């Protein structure tokens with residue numbers, strides 16, 4: 458399309474701050490945040506973007522017990538189940554990226570079903586990060602290579618970038634062209650690392666609930682002008 | 685408190701054009717700006733400064749010339765010099781100059797200055813991977829024992845403080861395959877100022893930005 462942007466990744470941040478300013482509790486920001494997600498996904502689908510990868514940055518996870526962080530992963534991806542039907546009806550291909558290996562088998566089956574169901578859709582490819590880390594991503598790929606070495610099928614010296622690239626999340630999709638981070642912080646926070654080696658980085662102070670189609674348009678135009 | 689700053693230096697040629705001068709003129713102004721950045725970092729308690737020359741045999745001799753004429757003063761200033769990158773294919777005289785310069789200064793306790801030469805963040809990670817694959821081949825390591833901490837011990841600069849701030853001059857908003865694994869939690873600061881003009885005030889503005897952002901976030 459005219460903006461020449463095939464794959465956009467977004468670090469969503471600012472929902473709690475947005476609620477706080479309103480005098481509302483965090484759950485109200487979660488709802489406004491969900492609504493801003495739906496709006497970003499329609500925008501991307503309507504603007505010919507091929508893939509949209511979303512990472513929810515939690516400013517609060519440092520105050521929550523580790524036991525709680527695992528459970529929230531439950532509800533989160535669980536919640537994203539009633540939503541699968543809607544994504545499918547909109548011709549979106551859903552993929553979950555992250556470490557879901559420790560997740561209960563019932564949910565892993567659900568994730569696989571969801572991905573299989575929407576795999577042949579021809580609209581936007583939507584990647585949702587769940588228990589995702591950039592370093593972990595690189596490490597799970599390294600492990601896959603470590604198994605081939607242990608099998609006898611790979612010589613350490615044959616490992617190059619191109620080969621490690623085939624084993625990181627989203628390698629079958631267009632490289633990430635643009636990473637947007639809302640909320641004001643200027644860090645990647647262990648979101649994508651290997652995949653953003655050549656991506657344009659766009660930071661905006663706008664809080665996620667307020668980030669709308671015109672903000673997304675501004676980012677794509679900055680990208681178009683910058684490339 | 686900012687301990688390790690990484691800078692993507694960019695804008696020398698654009699600067700020269702604006703001045704109506706030739707490329708060599710921007711290179712010269714660029715080198716002076718490198719000296720001023722290093723002095724500044726050393727004078728302000730920064731533990732490590734990592735520099736990457738962004739560009740879209742003669743440079744090899746210049747590299748030798750640069751090491752031969754600057755290493756003594758860096759040594760006197762208690763700077764520890766390290767070159768990061770794939771120098772495996774540089775001519776052996778240059779490889780030897782690099783090795784001696786690093787050896788001469790290895791024990792200094794002031795600023796560690798890392799100069800990227802033929803460096804790439806993906807290559808960096810891949811060299812660490814090869815190291816681990818070797819131990820797997822031998823039999824000293826099981827695939828499933830490989831974790832983040834471990835690969836971290838095999839990527840460049842693992843013995844130094846974590847990179848706190850990455851500064852990129854010149855106007856582009858990309859990492860361009862500079863550090864990747866190492867910038868997971870770093871503050872990213874972009875400025876349109878061209879490298880020859882990047883000065884103490886610009887450097888301080890990035891440091892202040894880092895400090896303020898550390899307070900608010």
Ligand SMILES: O=P(O)(O)C(O)(Cc1cccc(-c2cccc(-c3ccccc3)c2)c1)P(=O)(O)O
Pocket residue numbers: 483484487513514515517521529532533
């Ligand atoms: O609602 P909160 O954030 O006030 C709290 O109950 C934690 C929590 C409870 C229920 C639901 C959620 C929730 C709802 C929607 C999204 C998310 C979320 C999405 C992505 C990353 C982190 C969190 C979490 C969080 P907390 O224990 O942190 O006070």
Ligand SMILES: O=P(O)(O)C(O)(Cc1cccc(-c2cccc(-c3ccccc3)c2)c1)P(=O)(O)O
Pocket residue numbers: 494495498499500502503540541543544546547549
């Ligand atoms: O399908 P369209 O292009 O006709 C339209 O629904 C826009 C749209 C496109 C793709 C996805 C969505 C959409 C709608 C409802 C929910 C979601 C959704 C987004 C993220 C997670 C879960 C669900 C996405 C809407 P429109 O607003 O243009 O009529």
Ligand SMILES: O=P(O)(O)C(O)(Cc1cccc(-c2cccc(-c3ccccc3)c2)c1)P(=O)(O)O
Pocket residue numbers: 469470471472473474483486487488490491494511512513514515516517518537585665
């Ligand atoms: O913005 P924060 O860091 O203040 C916070 O809302 C976490 C958060 C960040 C970004 C997005 C979301 C969020 C909230 C609700 C739904 C979703 C969502 C994500 C993906 C698909 C569909 C819905 C994401 C939550 P927190 O729970 O840590 O207060």
Ligand SMILES: O=P(O)(O)C(O)(Cc1cccc(-c2cccc(-c3ccccc3)c2)c1)P(=O)(O)O
Pocket residue numbers: 693694695696697698707710711712714715718735736737738739740750799879
């Ligand atoms: O800024 P550019 O991309 O326009 C260009 O000057 C390349 C370049 C970028 C950044 C720094 C330098 C450069 C020039 C002179 C000296 C140094 C230098 C680097 C490290 C230690 C000492 C000196 C770096 C060159 P180019 O040769 O590609 O026109």
Ligand SMILES: O=P(O)(O)C(O)(Cc1cccc(-c2cccc(-c3ccccc3)c2)c1)P(=O)(O)O
Pocket residue numbers: 707708709711712737739742743746799800801802
């Ligand atoms: O100064 P010049 O224009 O006479 C010439 O040496 C080019 C040149 C001189 C000095 C520095 C550089 C240069 C360009 C790009 C990168 C670097 C560099 C410097 C330090 C580390 C890594 C890379 C240096 C190029 P030339 O190739 O035109 O003979």
